[PDB]
Amino acid sequence: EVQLQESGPGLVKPSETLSLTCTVSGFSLTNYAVSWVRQPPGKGLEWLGVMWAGGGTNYNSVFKSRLTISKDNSKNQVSLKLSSVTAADTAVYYCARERPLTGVMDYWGQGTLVTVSSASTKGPSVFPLAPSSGTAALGCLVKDYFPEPVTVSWNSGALTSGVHTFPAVLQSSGLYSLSSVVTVPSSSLGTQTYICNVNHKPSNTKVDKKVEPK
Amino acid sequence: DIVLTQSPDSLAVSLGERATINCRASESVDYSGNSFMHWFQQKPGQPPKLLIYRASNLESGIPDRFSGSGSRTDFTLTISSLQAEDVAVYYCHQSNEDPPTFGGGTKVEIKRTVAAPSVFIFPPSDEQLKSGTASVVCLLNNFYPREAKVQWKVDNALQSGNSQESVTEQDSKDSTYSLSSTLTLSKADYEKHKVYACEVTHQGLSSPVTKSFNRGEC
Numbered sequence A: 001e002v003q004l005q006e007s008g009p010g011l012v013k014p015s016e017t018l019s020l021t022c023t024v025s026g027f028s029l030t031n032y033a034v035s036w037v038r039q040p041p042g043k044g045l046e047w048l049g050v051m052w053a054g055g056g057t058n059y060n061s062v063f064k065s066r067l068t069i070s071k072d073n074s075k076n077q078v079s080l081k082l083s084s085v086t087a088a089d090t091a092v093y094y095c096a097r098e099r100p101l102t103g104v105m106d107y108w109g110q111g112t113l114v115t116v117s118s119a120s121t122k123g124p125s126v127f128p129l130a131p132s133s134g135t136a137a138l139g140c141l142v143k144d145y146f147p148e149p150v151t152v153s154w155n156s157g158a159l160t161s162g163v164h165t166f167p168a169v170l171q172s173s174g175l176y177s178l179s180s181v182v183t184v185p186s187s188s189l190g191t192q193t194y195i196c197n198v199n200h201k202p203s204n205t206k207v208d209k210k211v212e213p214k
Numbered sequence B: 001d002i003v004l005t006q007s008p009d010s011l012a013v014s015l016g017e018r019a020t021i022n023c024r025a026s027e028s029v030d031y032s033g034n035s036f037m038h039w040f041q042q043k044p045g046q047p048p049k050l051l052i053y054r055a056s057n058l059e060s061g062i063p064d065r066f067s068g069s070g071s072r073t074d075f076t077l078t079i080s081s082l083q084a085e086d087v088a089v090y091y092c093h094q095s096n097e098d099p100p101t102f103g104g105g106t107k108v109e110i111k112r113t114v115a116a117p118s119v120f121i122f123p124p125s126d127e128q129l130k131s132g133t134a135s136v137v138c139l140l141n142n143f144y145p146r147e148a149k150v151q152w153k154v155d156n157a158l159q160s161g162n163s164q165e166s167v168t169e170q171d172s173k174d175s176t177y178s179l180s181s182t183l184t185l186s187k188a189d190y191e192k193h194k195v196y197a198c199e200v201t202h203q204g205l206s207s208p209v210t211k212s213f214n215r216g217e218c
């Protein structure tokens, strides 16, 4: 199966250099091109550049002065370097496999969110949203992290039906907060174990929080 | 650069009915009797997913209700029988001329029956209170349409300036929205008051429903 995965720093200071890596599997970089595309939050898609199968590069002219794409076929990796970053470079960065003859981008990585900011990295505090009293709701409050994003799974991905993870809100403090909730049977609250798995990649923080009645 | 202009910007469609999305290009996207216009589906927190390549070719694993047509400067994606899981932003993509460019996107939503929110209220954890902040959370679960009012009451005194709201995009199975409201007090102000209530107004409720707790908490 064709897979790509982006890796990035999360936070980059203004005027510094953004470094990203795209690791590929299920295909060879000798056969396929790889493109970099970014998406500012709640905006459209902007193409940055491509590493061709043969090892040549093609760049969006607006990034010519700041952008370098390189690869190592033998390490299954394509790299991006974007110098002199400003707030305008805040985006989810995607790497995509490109069909070399047609320019069709057929497989995309999950993406890495790059925040350009002078502020400090900060991992979240995780608090339970405990059930009380057919249907019961429980959750986790993920408070006071920077930058975005946080991802939440339930019972290491075993529980998915009824899960709602809300968009993060920016608090007046300048730190993000989000809640993740799941609706379950009322009869299950006593017996069944519920753990939210909170991942904050920008701070390399992983928090498991058991959620149970008061 | 080739500019791609999509139409509509957004549309609400009933389950089983037709969605038509147009993409126009500022220049021809054809070379040697081949059209280099492609269509993507993007759901929230996910990458674009290829639906159609070179105007009319359905990508493997994509259902046949998706189809594409057009050439030169005029292209159409059709979803013949819209399913719940097809709620997304749809993008056209040209690869004829450098730089490759994308359309501004088209938001597809399901128009479905009115659904009342199930309301839940969550007191702040003892863990959090030791930090000196109190977060009270009101959850509105699985409602249609999107429009909802949450009112926070503290000892029946209606709150203002000290809450924030977040709404999910439309659920891929039941086409509903969910909403969380968070009330943020200092531990001091939290301990001054007893009765905490969120009042939910919505089309699916005949009158506004209130969920509440006492800080005593059993």
Ligand SMILES: [Cl-]
Binding pocket: A052, A053, A054, A055, A056, A057
């Ligand atoms: Cl080359």
Ligand SMILES: [Cl-]
Binding pocket: A099, A102, A104, B053, B054
């Ligand atoms: Cl192709």
